[PDB]
Design a protein around this ligand. Structure first.
Ligand SMILES: Cc1cc2nc3c(=O)[nH]c(=O)nc-3n(C[C@H](O)[C@H](O)[C@H](O)COP(=O)(O)O)c2cc1C
Ligand SMILES: Cc1cc2nc3c(=O)[nH]c(=O)nc-3n(C[C@H](O)[C@H](O)[C@H](O)COP(=O)(O)O)c2cc1C
Ligand SMILES: C=C(C)c1ccc(C)c(O)c1
Ligand SMILES: C=C(C)c1ccc(C)c(O)c1
Ligand SMILES: [Cl-]
Ligand SMILES: [Cl-]
Ligand SMILES: [Mg+2]
Ligand SMILES: [Mg+2]
Ligand SMILES: [Mg+2]
Ligand SMILES: [Mg+2]
Ligand code: NA
Ligand code: NA
Ligand code: NA
Ligand code: NA
Ligand code: NA
Ligand code: NA
Ligand code: NA
Ligand code: NA
Lengths: 399, 399
């Protein structure tokens, strides 16, 4: 069905429908697919779904000139811990990714691989089964009681990374980025948001370290910036973006309750601008808005009203992708895209609307999403959401 | 004469004319007199002007319930270096300040003493004459070539403060604050703006130190925060405010060209909010806007368009006074005061309009200021600017 109470607005007369260049890619509009974990990868080996993933991405690439950021992809076994999320370290994985990237490019769209390391969000029992550590910044603060207990039961207590282990992750980020480009991706996004490992280093709640990787703003940002620099060197700044969620609380990050949180993120933005002014500007910065501090709460819930991401624009002077509850709020998008370097990521409603871009241009009703099939091993709720035309044929204008 | 091309707007229907409490003071409107050095203090002894200062402040206190921040006042001889700016360390000074504060209070207005330490902005020859150091954060970066040369000629080369000397300044801030309150002031403002000593520590251009007072965001903010804490302890948080100019370039500060500048100031704001949440909220934060990066350039010049102070509001949750080119821009004020904790400082046009508040309420023409008498040893251009009524009698509606 269509979302019942929604009053759509046509956005074709806004900058959402003006072309923009991101990295090497000439986008034809500014509606971006943000990274969306869907849990259709198959075990063993974290293999992108051999039956359905090409179709899923093909459907969502259908509007020419769309920027797609993939579902999060693990850079190595140690970086993972969810059996049904994909990786980008193995030949068997890259065979499937190549097909996905080719399909997106055949639709004249673009694809950026999000590179993920889970840290404390991983399942410690899966890691133990596979002979892997349960990693985070620290060893004395935990995501929640259940995770702490699972780790202990698995004889895999949370481990504070050594400097050498940080370096090993950096090597894996580099190789994952190389694999992504060699397989045909247009670029990569470094996931430093949503309470995953790099965010666990950025945040003073999760990072109680007293070495050079914690205990100050500069130290907490060190790992993220080392990954940025290593990837810029390996594949070029034009093929690298960075995702941040300053106000996020998902995965036990601090959000606005931490009075130093804006400074922490302002520092990162400043360091990116410094690199840019020195000739190595990242393709984009991608921000999760305080509109959505936890993406598993219904739109409108978990909104933080005490802060804005606008500060980033005073510091970083490149493209900015903003995501969080924008599909149901075209009136907000209309204002935000007046800024000529702003793009809008649409997550949950891209799950349910493969032709979302047409719907945004033309002010059409939106398909309701089905949260129960966000994570499921099924084509249902993955590749069977209809286009607007298909929905009309199903009678959804009258349901 | 009145400013020729100005189209006034009545602001009586805005929050500029709603009461607000700042510290212990019930303000009746939100037009604030920011600190304005006028150079009428007499030498020797940096004595507030015995002939005219009471009249100057009485005139500008005339609208009941006005918050006045004094001209910058030196906390000690070593903190000074301008012969015609006043101090607040001596009995002879405080005799005159007491008369000023009493006069302001008789007009049912309020007075906050701005506490100043000049650092590298001081005149090294005046300091040498008096047996005093020429101080800054560092000893290897200078305000400008002329200052560096004057210091060398005076056998008083710029000196990087020792930790003990920093502590001595802190003692002097404490005593200056105590003197101010004992003489009848409502509170004090710590000057950490406009390229004076505390700002010289905040800014990475002027602060090349490698001890705990430089080399990182936290270290560069240490001195300012130590002054804040020492004054809160001495006289109470309700009697203390802090002035900052994130985007200022006056006195050779970095401004927006420094990509880390927003992070530096965000850190300070965060530390103030942390103290507030722990029960010690400063009375206000006072910000100079990027509208005026140098207050000795005509309105409209030296405007930095690449940054906003709005970030501070995501972090600090108390009152904010904003200053910089607001008199000629009532349309901007009308928007800014929609925020219910925003006050507006009017500097140069309070020099020339003793009844500025009435003029703002009622949308009246403004007296043109005379920059030549901003700093002069004269009643002319100090206490002889007319009220609106007096200007009409002079025929200024027809000049
Ligand atoms: C099912 C689901 C999976 C997600 N997976 C990822 C992910 O892999 N990487 C990431 O950075 N964010 C992920 N997110 C967060 C989204 O990218 C997005 O920031 C968020 O859903 C808010 O945007 P929206 O309101 O348009 O959905 C996910 C969100 C959902 C609901
Ligand atoms: C003559 C003059 C003297 C000033 N003296 C001080 C001072 O003692 N302390 C301070 O913090 N700012 C001082 N300022 C800066 C003003 O407080 C204010 O921030 C600036 O003039 C911008 O506001 P305006 O455009 O309303 O004048 C001075 C400015 C002028 C023009
Ligand atoms: C499992 C992954 C990669 C994941 C899922 C959800 C979110 C919000 C995220 O940031 C990452
Ligand atoms: C001499 C003093 C106290 C002074 C003068 C002008 C400005 C802008 C300032 O910040 C301070
Ligand atoms: Cl799993
Ligand atoms: Cl002088
Ligand atoms: Mg242990
Ligand atoms: Mg169902
Ligand atoms: Mg020396
Ligand atoms: Mg003259
Ligand atoms: Na419409
Ligand atoms: Na099938
Ligand atoms: Na802005
Ligand atoms: Na789950
Ligand atoms: Na008017
Ligand atoms: Na006289
Ligand atoms: Na705001
Ligand atoms: Na001068």
């Amino acid at each position: 069905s269509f979302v019942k109470d929604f009053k759509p607005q046509a956005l074709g007369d806004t900058n959402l429908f003006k072309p923009i260049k991101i990295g090497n890619n000439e986008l034809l509009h500014r509606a971006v697919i943000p990274p969306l974990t869907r849990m259709r990868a198959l075990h063993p080996g974290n293999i992108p779904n051999r039956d359905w993933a090409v179709e899923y991405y093909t459907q969502r690439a259908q509007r020419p000139g769309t920027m797609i950021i993939t579902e999060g992809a693990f850079i190595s076994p140690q970086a993972g811990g969810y059996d049904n999320a994909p990786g980008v370290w193995s030949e068997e994985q890259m065979v499937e990714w190549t097909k996905i990237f080719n399909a997106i490019h055949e639709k004249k769209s673009f694809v950026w691989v999000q590179l993920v390391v889970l840290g404390w969000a991983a399942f410690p029992d899966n890691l133990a089964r596979d002979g892997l550590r349960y990693d985070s910044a620290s060893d004395n603060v935990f995501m929640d009681a259940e995770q702490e207990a699972k780790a202990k039961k698995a004889n895999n207590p949370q481990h504070s990374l050594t400097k050498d282990e940080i370096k090993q992750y950096i090597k894996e980020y580099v190789q994952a980025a190389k694999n992504s480009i060699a397989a045909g991706a247009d670029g990569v996004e470094i996931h430093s948001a949503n309470g995953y490992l790099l965010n666990q280093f950025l945040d003073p709640h999760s990072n109680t370290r007293t070495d050079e990787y914690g205990g100050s703003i500069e130290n907490r940002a060190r790992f993220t910036l080392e990954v940025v620099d290593a990837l810029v060197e390996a594949i070029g700044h034009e093929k690298v973006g960075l995702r941040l969620s300053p106000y996020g609380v998902f995965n036990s990050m601090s959000g606005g309750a931490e009075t130093g949180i804006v400074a922490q993120y302002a520092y990162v933005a400043g360091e990116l601008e410094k690199r840019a002014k020195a000739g190595k500007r990242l393709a984009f910065v991608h921000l999760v808005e305080p509109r959505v501090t936890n993406p598993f709460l219904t739109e409108g819930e978990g909104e933080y009203e005490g802060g804005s991401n606008d500060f980033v624009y005073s510091i970083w002077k490149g493209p900015v992708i903003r995501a969080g509850n924008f599909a149901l709020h075209p009136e907000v998008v209309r204002e935000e895209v007046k800024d000529k370097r702003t793009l809008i990521g649409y997550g949950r409603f891209f799950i349910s609307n493969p032709d979302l871009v047409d719907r945004l241009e033309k002010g059409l009703p939106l398909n309701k999403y089905d949260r129960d099939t966000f994570y499921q091993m099924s084509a249902h709720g993955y590749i069977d959401y209809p286009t607007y035309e298909e929905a009309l044929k199903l009678g959804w204008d009258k349901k």
